[PDB]
């Protein structure tokens, strides 16, 4: 009843996905979920975020069309539950 790895094979300690992205494209990074997390935050930088404005966030996985000054940091992904917490780091930078 879990997906740890419903992306890719990509759960090192503190890294997950580390791409660059040129000045106006896409760029993404896939969490994971199962009957345990249900909110996914995605900490851009190094602190929580979910936006919308270029970045469609969702609760599985953030999806940047334009990779702006935005994607410039890590973009951790923290999937948790009332009691359980598990997190992935996409390192996500613009050109």
């Given at each position: 009843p879990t997906l740890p790895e419903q992306a890719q094979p990509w759960g090192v300690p503190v890294e997950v996905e580390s791409l660059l992205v040129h000045p106006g494209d896409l760029l993404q990074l896939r969490c994971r979920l199962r009957d345990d997390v249900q909110s996914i935050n995605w900490l851009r930088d190094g602190v929580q975020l979910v936006e919308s404005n270029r970045t469609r966030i969702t609760g599985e996985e953030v999806e940047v069309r334009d990779s702006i000054?935005?994607?410039?940091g890590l973009y951790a992904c923290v999937t948790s539950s009332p009691s359980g917490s598990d997190t992935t780091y996409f390192s996500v930078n613009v050109s």
């Open positions: 000054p935005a994607d410039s």
